[PDB]
Amino acid sequence: ELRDQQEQVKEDMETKCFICGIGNDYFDTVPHGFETHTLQEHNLANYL
Amino acid sequence: YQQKLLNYFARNFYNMRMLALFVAFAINFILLFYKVSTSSVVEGKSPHRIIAVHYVLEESSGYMEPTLRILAILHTIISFFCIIGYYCLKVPLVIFKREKEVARKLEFDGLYITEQPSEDDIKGQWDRLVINTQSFPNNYWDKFVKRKVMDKYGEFYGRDRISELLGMDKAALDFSDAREKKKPKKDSSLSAVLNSIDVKYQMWKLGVVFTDNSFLYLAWYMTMSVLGHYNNFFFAAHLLDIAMGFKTLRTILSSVTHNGKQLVLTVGLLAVVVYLYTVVAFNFFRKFYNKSEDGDTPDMKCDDMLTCYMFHMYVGVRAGGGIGDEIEDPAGDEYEIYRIIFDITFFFFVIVILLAIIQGLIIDAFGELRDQQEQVKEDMETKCFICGIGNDYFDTVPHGFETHTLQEHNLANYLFFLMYLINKDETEHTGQESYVWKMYQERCWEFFPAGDCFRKQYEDQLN
Amino acid sequence: TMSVLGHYNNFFFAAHLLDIAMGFKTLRTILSSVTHNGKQLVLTVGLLAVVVYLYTVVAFNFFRKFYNKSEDGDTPDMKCDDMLTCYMFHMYVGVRAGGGIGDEIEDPAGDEYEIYRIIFDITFFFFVIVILLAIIQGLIIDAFG
Amino acid sequence: MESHKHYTQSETEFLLSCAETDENETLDYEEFVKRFHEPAKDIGFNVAVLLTNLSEHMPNDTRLQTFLELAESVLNYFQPFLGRIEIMGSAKRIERVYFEISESSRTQWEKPQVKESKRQFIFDVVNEGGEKEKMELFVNFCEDTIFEMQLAAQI
Ligand SMILES: [Zn+2]
Ligand SMILES: [Zn+2]
Questions:
Q1: How far is B138 from chain D (nearest CA, A)?
Q2: Half-sphere exposure for B220 (CA within 13 Å, toward CB)
Q3: Whole-angstrom distance, CA of residue B347 vs CA of residue B312
């Protein structure tokens, strides 16, 4: 159960954005779109 | 002849490895027929040394001892051939990887120009020795690194420092009169002089191959094989090669290896818990630990600390029921209830719980490895490795995803294009080949398609 | 063949009880757990044999004097002062002990090899009894999953 | 000559007419190297590349299909060597690239040792992951493999 919990949180973080939850499929039209969205546009550090 | 012999020894490395395994098994099977003599040998009588150690008395045969001797000699020879084959085959890949890493570090990050790494990264510190040698790009097949670092770092840091560091000290490499054009080479066959060898580079390469772990294992194999002649029981240590010689056996042992980091911590917890139980037993229940037989004997007991701790660690974990099986029963004593809780808690915490953790870590390792393989299989079946578009878009046309994976975006094709680019002269590069080659030189990776494809951009009917 | 041999000896009819394994779907499901990893179970048993062989090598070389199974001393001393005898001794008693080989040997009461024999027994118990049987019992669970 | 070349002067006797190395009623294999060893491949491969590129970029054209069905033989012969990759072009458009694949390269990549390394490499980038290192890890694997095959050429 602990291993499955860690796998689930890793998959959630890799799949959807933490703020808007749009999904990587829409952003990946532009190359590195999801990474750009997670690093520049919507960032936990910036919102903090 | 030496080159042909080296190529032959490099070709059949796994063959000689498995043959060494087979002969080691044969020797160990021969070893199962030993004996120890008796009947009061010439040494005088409890004799100090009347051992008359061993003999290989056979079952109505006399072929076993010469077989053992010749098999030991043969095993040593075969294992030496294995070392030669390893150096001939797998060392160049390691040297190529190291040269590639240091070349890209110098050309892109300036490891020994603007960084100067600290006392840590001992391998990186040792890599500084190959910088100033003459034959530095020996295996990286990129001989322009020394020249191209100047155009990037020479102006900002001075030509002299980089020239001295790299080792091509010359003003403008401009010849004056024929520059000693040509002459008969001193080196020739039958070892004429053979002195044009870089001792610095040879020592660096020797250090790398003497730090390589597989070469360490082969050296240990050598040591055990040559010790087997000193004592033939030392050939038993070569049976461990089955662990790394079989893929299924590696899969079996990877279950233990996956959580070996936590197994030792569990054993440490067991030691700590047993120590606490020994503390309590030494303080309170010292009188019960009388292991002397039938009372009327010299009372041997654990009225100490180290003795009691070793008693608990030896007998008490290997009991199947805890320490209560090996102590005098509390038949009508004031500490009966307390000793009962002592024994029951010891059994329920050491025997039942800790061994359950030890036996559950292995099962969790099995599950995790299986889930990892399932995940990689599902990822490969779902999305393309290059663009990652997804099979849903491609499957509109029948067998669209299979066509995309086999023809359009293929790992084999992308691998062969790199060889085609590398083995072609820059004069014959076309526009696209030069456009890709430049970005390969500068390490951009933007020419790899990502989020797009030929069908995505141009539909079969123009859109 | 077994049915016609049952007339020669009526105890040979006991071999027909194995038909339940292939006559019931639920029983096939139960036995498929073992059959799924039967390829690796035999390799685990082979590792057990190799490890026990190494332990026998060490015991034959060093701890030969402890293996005196003769009763009350004053009897003809039966002991494993050989190689095949010691190996069969370890494979017979030492795996089926629940605590390793230390349960069936004379205790090291004040000997120069006491510490070494202690590590010998503890390592034997922790590697043969605990770890290998854990792998054997974990393969079945992984097959179920 | 019984396998493929039919018995006509334009097909069968043309070979005998070309084979005139000596008048001693004997022939050597040096004609094989002298003619159609290098030039056969050298021009035929470029012709096949041109035809494949034209067919791929000219869909739904009736005229090109006649050339395709007539050059089916040479295209079938050149299928193993012809390769296709897709790159981001200088005009910021996806463009296909055609090149040549040597026979020794295709032979070494089929060996079990190389195929085992490919399986392990895929097993790593999926588990460890990567967002920009993925293409860097792919090229690093390619260069390490290329060294293995070029070393394997020195048998
Ligand atoms: Zn967002
Ligand atoms: Zn693709």
A1: 12
A2: 10
A3: 12
